[PDB]
Paper text:
Aquaporins are water channels found in the cell membrane, where they allow the passage of water molecules in and out of the cells.
Specifically, a hydrophobic residue in position 3, as in the T126M mutant, correlated with increased glucosylation of glycopeptides. Since the tetramers of both A147T and T126M were less stable than wild-type AQP2, this may play a role in the ER-retention of both these mutants. Overall, T126M gave crystals which diffracted to highest resolution, (~3–3.3 Å), followed by T125M (~3.7–4 Å).
Author numbering:
A (entry chain B): 6 to 238
B (entry chain C): 6 to 241
C (entry chain D): 2 to 233
D (entry chain A): 2 to 240
Write the structure that this text describes.
């Protein structure tokens, strides 16, 4: 019961640092405007560092979509999945509120809210978010699959660069979500809920798609006791 | 029976995600035009992520040139190589068609077709694409070599940054192909086939050079007794 | 023992040489070169790959702290005698100012300029900045303590690259506020060479409080040692 | 003998092919200005990922020096015969000039220019420039010696990346002073092709001294090997 509290707190602290570092590096800084690779690096190295620092404590989800995909695949109780999602949403809004407090009001602006950029249709954008989170969920599962042992090699760096890979594409359409907590945090702080359903349906459908594709299509487990039914039939 | 189907599907899904993410990060230029390092990071981390995600399922080729290269030193049969190349070409055009659907019409443009750039001639260009794939195939063979001298596992990031390394050079000449499927996908969707042979002869010839250079010149692998007999009894 | 004595001397020398190379490469890549002004990602990569290279090169000799803050974090965290920590902090401050003095005499005088002294940027207040420096160093010691935790021996992991990209991560954000310190030696080095001590206490209070916060958070809240025989 | 063995011939050819690919990719990515001018981070990444990829591709075959300074560094440390060191340096110089001549052939004449020769930049003096090149190669040699240290546990691929990012680290600083050499073969290759030899001694004295300095510092001062079979057992001592 005490290790579960450490894990929920770690998920809270991790999403706090992720959103604080991520949005603050994505703000419109006048003299030095951030580039797409610069923002992708910020979010990328953010997940990779927090997975390194807190992966052994809680699994380092830092993402409700990852937690939901973990609910379909790995052995996580619906009790733990709810506590994780709740901890991530609370940590995210705390990191965005903290960033707002420390960032001068001149630079804050939209506080890096997710908005449909490059005149992307919501139906077009929700399809992008689907495949953005799909490749991340595929990489997270493969990097943390216990059946692979120590063979993955670079779990923290690979998951980070997978997040950066999605940002290198998703920034132009929606500013890249791949995380419902990363989208909700600046939307609550600064009043901006432009097409917010895209940043929830997209990642969640993309996450459950990658979990089902991996755990039961690409690399399913061996048949369990259910084979006794085919013998009886 | 099923494991081969899961591998071919992985090659299809991997090339689908690779082309979707790769070409998309090369278009999408409103007020923020992508730089050479930015585009190279997209293709680089794309291969590295998909080698990490699907390498243990299919081998993570995501390249008909790489699949052709593995025909000599990857224990891949001519049956599997054809199924892999077909899955790569189908996934590539599916990723380019999907990107076209989700990208607004004004931004699409060329859809990141491989094209001759900076007044580079097709003979000069096909020479670049050879060495772009030579170093990639050279890195893949060592990264998947049991005698490379490290703990078991495949370095997906090393393979990814090898793809990125080729882009920091190849973009200025051809937009960097290194992958015949990566070139056919936007060529089929858009219709632009200008000097399309450069993006096929280049990667395929560069791959067979790296495979022959590694497996016969640089680091010839250890032959099993059954493999050793196919040589001897095939002689005289 | 005689073998134990040199190993400590090898470690103190490595800490001096490491902070010397870190400050020399970091500041020199952050200078305002007119033909190619460095971008935030360019500067972040310079400091990031600098730590990662030096941790790769000297981690197995001294631990590759390269930061008085993380050395203090090991005092409260990875329990190390105050003797070794004092020798480490002194070597870092001496190597840093030596690296900044070397870069000064190595770079033409016109372009030396501010020598990448940590300074308040974008009208950020000292109270807001000292809060940023806290969380920049907080995540760094969180990554360092996990990458070097005695209990994670088995698989070697990627400590040098992870810590290096953790330093870069802090620069993606910290550059816009203070030019990113995360290291009191990296701040004292160019301030001593080129007299610029504007709000220097921020670059000392910030990293030290964030380091002790992350060391206390790791060793007592997140991943403490087993109190009893329940799991040892 | 060592000369008449296949592994030595395979190692010399690997050193030749590796330097050929490194110079071809490095200069060409640093020299292609027309409408897209390469950035310092871009050039640093090209040379960085270049060394990292070739160390990963050919390190197990020859050691992947790709640098007469690095070869000299192991001549002062890593058991490399003075016969092997001469064959390695000769293979690197031949592969470099072959890679530079190859790049000149495939790059259109409008963009070739000086072919990315190492040149003193931003009014840096030769004494100041030769001091940069020393410390650029020193940290690289320190990183190479540690990335190849059998006493250090690492995961696959990360040592090649660490060496690569060490090269990229030097370029993030060295480009502003000299265009970043850290390799006498990388400087001679375009100098022979294009014919520009301005202050060529800086790109030779600097990297070599920095390599010997780094090899001596690592093998004798920082992390020397054991002397007796009881050394490691003695380090334990009491509890």
């Amino acid at each position: 019961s005490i290790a579960f509290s450490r894990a929920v707190f770690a998920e809270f602290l991790a999403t706090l640092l992720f959103v604080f570092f991520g949005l603050g590096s994505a703000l419109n800084w006048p003299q030095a405007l951030p580039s797409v690779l610069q923002i992708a690096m910020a979010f990328g190295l953010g997940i990779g560092t927090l997975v390194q620092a807190l992966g052994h404590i809680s699994g380092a989800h830092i993402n409700p979509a990852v937690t939901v995909a973990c609910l379909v695949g790995c052995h996580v109780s619906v009790l733990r999945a709810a506590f994780y999602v709740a901890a991530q949403l609370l940590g995210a809004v705390a990191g965005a509120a903290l960033l707002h407090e420390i960032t001068p009001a001149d630079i804050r602006g939209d506080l890096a809210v997710n908005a449909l950029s490059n005149s992307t249709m919501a139906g077009q954008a929700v399809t992008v978010e689907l495949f953005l989170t799909l490749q991340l969920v595929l990489c997270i599962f493969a990097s943390t699959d216990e059946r692979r042992g120590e063979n993955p090699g670079t779990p923290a760096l690979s998951i980070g660069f997978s997040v950066a890979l999605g940002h290198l594409l998703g920034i132009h359409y929606t500013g890249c979500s791949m995380n419902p907590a990363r989208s909700l945090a600046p939307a609550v702080v600064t009043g901006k809920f432009d097409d917010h359903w895209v940043f929830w349906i997209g990642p969640l459908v993309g996450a459950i798609l990658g979990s089902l594709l991996y755990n039961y299509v690409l690399f399913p487990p061996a048949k369990s006791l259910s084979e006794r039914l085919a013998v009886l039939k």
